[PDB]
Amino acid sequence: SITDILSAEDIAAALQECQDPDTFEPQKFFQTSGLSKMSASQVKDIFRFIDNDQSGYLDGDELKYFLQKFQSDARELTESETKSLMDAADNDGDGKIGADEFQEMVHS
Numbered sequence: 001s002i003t004d005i006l007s008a009e010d011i012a013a014a015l016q017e018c019q020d021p022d023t024f025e026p027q028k029f030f031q032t033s034g035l036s037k038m039s040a041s042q043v044k045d046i047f048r049f050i051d052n053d054q055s056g057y058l059d060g061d062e063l064k065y066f067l068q069k070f071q072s073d074a075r076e077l078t079e080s081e082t083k084s085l086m087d088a089a090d091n092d093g094d095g096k097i098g099a100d101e102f103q104e105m106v107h108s
């Protein structure tokens with residue numbers, strides 16, 4: 001589980017940092033949560049928990065509910081914040097985030 005990989009305190013800190021709407025920034029979240037320090041294998045396990053429909057890609061509602069995978073009572077991302085996530089990750093113009101793209105974004 002995500003819980004088996006990141007510390008609960010770092011997750012709590014990351015959510016605290018982006019409590020107000022339109023303050024989520026991918027890079028800050030990945031740093032505060034500790035995701036940017038994890039190995040490729042650990043980042044892939046997190047990717048699998050976020051990919052709710054097991055399509056192999058993050059898209060649609062999975063972006064809006066991104067924080068909710070870390071704590072089920074977290075807020076939804078705004079449309080602007082979901083666009084920031086896609087802008088940060090997409091490199092092949094398909095409008096979805098593959099596992100490779102996720103790894104590259106997290107480690108940036």
Ligand SMILES: [Ca+2]
Binds near residue numbers: 038039
């Ligand atoms: Ca490391």
Ligand SMILES: [Ca+2]
Binds near residue numbers: 051052053054055057
């Ligand atoms: Ca998916």
Ligand SMILES: [Ca+2]
Binds near residue numbers: 071073
């Ligand atoms: Ca909570």
Ligand SMILES: [Ca+2]
Binds near residue numbers: 090092093094101
């Ligand atoms: Ca893509």
